Amino acid sequence: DRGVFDLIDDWLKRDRFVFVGWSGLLLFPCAFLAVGGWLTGITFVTSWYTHGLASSFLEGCNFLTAAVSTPANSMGHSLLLLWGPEAQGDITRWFQIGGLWTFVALHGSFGVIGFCLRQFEIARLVGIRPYNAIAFSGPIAVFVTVFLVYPLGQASWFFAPSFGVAAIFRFLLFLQGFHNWTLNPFHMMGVAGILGGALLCAIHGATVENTLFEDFTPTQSEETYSMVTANRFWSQIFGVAFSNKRWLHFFMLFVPVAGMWTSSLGIVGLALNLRSYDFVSQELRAAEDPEFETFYTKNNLLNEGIRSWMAAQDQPHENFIFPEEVLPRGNAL
C-alpha cells in the first residue's frame, strides 16, 4: 500500500499454497525446530547419561519406546541453552545432559503461541469470530501446565514428561503412584470433558447423517438435516434434546475445552504436591480398624507398590537401595 510495512503485510497475507501471516514468522521456525528436534532426538540422541536409558533408534529402540528424555536432575530448572554454562557450546555434551528436551519444550511453547496467533490472524483475515483460538487455549493450557508448570514446581525438569510414547505411559503411572492423580476431582472433570467431547462428536455426527434430507452442495442455503426430527428423536429416546443449532455447537466447543482447562488446574496443584492423595477420615478408620477396607484404601496400597518398585530405576540419580523386605507386597502384608 503506502509504506514498507504495508508491502510486507500484503506479502505475508497473500493467498499462496500455505498462509504465512505475521504469526508465521514465529510459528514456522519454532514449530519446525520443535518437530525437527524431536525427530532428531528419537533417532540419534540417547538418555544414558540422564536417565540410564536407551531411547533412540540408534540404540535399538522402536517408535513406541524411543523418546526425547528430560534433562538430568542435577540440571535443576536450567534453561540448558547450547551456549549456557552447562554445555558451553559443545553440542555433544548438550545432547548428553538432556538439552534437547528444553530445546523441544521451549520451541514447542513458542510454536503453540504462534499457532494460536495464526488462528487469530486468519480469523481476522477471513472475517469470522475467533472461537477456534479460544478452543485451542485448551491444548495450550494442557501443554503449559504439564510440560512447563509441573516440572517448575517439582525439583527439576527431570520429572516432566519425556517426549515419547512409552515415556508418556510412565508419566501416567508416575502421577498415579505418587500423586493419586485419578482421585483428583480436577482430573475427573477432565475425563468428563474429554469423554463427553468424544460422545458429542459421535452422537452429533450420527444424528446429522441419520436425520438427513432426501436430496451437500457447497452453496446450499438450506440445511441438509432435519432439526425437528432430530429433536423429536432424542426427546423420546433420552428425555431431552437440542433445539438450538447454535447452542449445540457452542456445547461441542465447551465440553472438551473445559475438560482441558479443569484438568490443567489440578496439574498446577500437583506441581506443588497439593494432591488429592487421601481421605483422612477413611485413612484414620483403617488404621484403628484393620478389618475396614474400601476400594480407595486398596488403591493407596497399589500407589505404594508403584512408588517403591519404580523409584530405583525411575529416579537413578538418587541411590534408592531398597532391600526386598522393605519392598511392599500383598503377600507379606
Ligand X SMILES: CC1=C(/C=C/C(C)=C/C=C/C(C)=C/C=C/C=C(C)/C=C/C=C(C)/C=C/C2=C(C)CCCC2(C)C)C(C)(C)CCC1
Ligand Y SMILES: CCCCCCCCCCCCCCCC(=O)OC[C@H](CO[C@@H]1O[C@H](CS(=O)(=O)O)[C@@H](O)[C@H](O)[C@H]1O)OC(=O)CCCCCCCCCCCCCCC
Ligand Z SMILES: CC(C)=CCC/C(C)=C/CC/C(C)=C/CC/C(C)=C/CC/C(C)=C/CC/C(C)=C/CC/C(C)=C/CC/C(C)=C/CC/C(C)=C/CC1=CC(=O)C(C)=C(C)C1=O
Ligand U SMILES: CCCCCCCCCCCCCCCCCC(=O)OC[C@H](CO[C@@H]1O[C@H](CO)[C@H](O)[C@H](O)[C@H]1O)OC(=O)CCCCCCCCCCCCCCCCC
* 249 in a known ligand binding site: yes
Nearer to ligand Y, 52 or 89 (CB): 89
* 51 in a known ligand binding site: no
Which residues are CB-contacts of 235 (< 8 A; sequence separation ≥ 6)?
241
* 77 in a known ligand binding site: no
Residue of the chain from 21, 33, 38, 190 that contacts ligand PHO (CB under 6 A): 38
Nearer to ligand DGD, 109 or 299 (CB): 109
Cβ at position 235, least distance to ligand Z in Å: 8
Q: Is 152 in the site for ligand DGD (CB under 6 A)?
A: yes
Q: Is 22 in the site for ligand U (CB under 6 A)?
A: yes
Which residues are CB-contacts of 100 (< 8 A; sequence separation ≥ 6)?
37, 40, 41, 45, 68, 94
Residue type, 193: G
Q: Is 278 in the site for ligand U (CB under 6 A)?
A: no
Nearer to ligand U, 6 or 304 (CB): 6
Nearer to ligand PHO, 66 or 230 (CB): 66
Give me 141's grid cell. 493450557
Residue 286 · residue 297 · CB < 8 Å: yes
Nearer to ligand X, 29 or 269 (CB): 29
Residue 138 CB neighbour total at 10 angstroms: 22
- Segment 90 to 119, residues that bind ligand X, using CB under 6 A: 103
Residue 22 partner contact from ligand CLA, ligand U, ligand Y, none using kind-dependent CB cut-offs of 5 to 8 Å: ligand U
The whole-angstrom separation of Cα 190 and Cα 1 is: 48
* Residue numbers at the binding site for ligand Z (CB under 6 A): 188-189, 192-193, 196, 199-200, 203-204, 207-208, 227, 230-231, 234, 238, 241-242, 248, 255, 258-259, 262
The whole-angstrom separation of Cα 282 and Cα 297 is: 8
Residue 24 · residue 39 · CB < 8 Å: no
Stretch that binds ligand X, among 28-36, 145-153, 255-263, 282-290 (CB under 6 A): 28-36
Matching residue, cell 511392599 = 328
* 238 in a known ligand binding site: no
The whole-angstrom separation of Cα 84 and Cα 97 is: 12
The whole-angstrom separation of Cα 111 and Cα 91 is: 23
Cβ at position 210, least distance to ligand Y in Å: 22
Residue of the chain from 23, 145, 162, 263 that contacts other proteins (CB under 8 A): 162
Q: What are phi and psi of 189, to 5 degrees?
A: -65, -30
What is the phi-psi region of residue 273: left when phi exceeds 0, alpha when psi lies from -120 to 50, beta otherwise?
A: left
| Residue among 291, 294, 265 nearest 142 (CA) | 265
Q: Is 173 in the site for ligand DGD (CB under 6 A)?
A: no
Stretch that binds ligand DGD, among 51-59, 144-152, 160-168, 221-229 (CB under 6 A): 144-152
Binding-site entries: 107, 119, 132, 187, 204, 242, 249
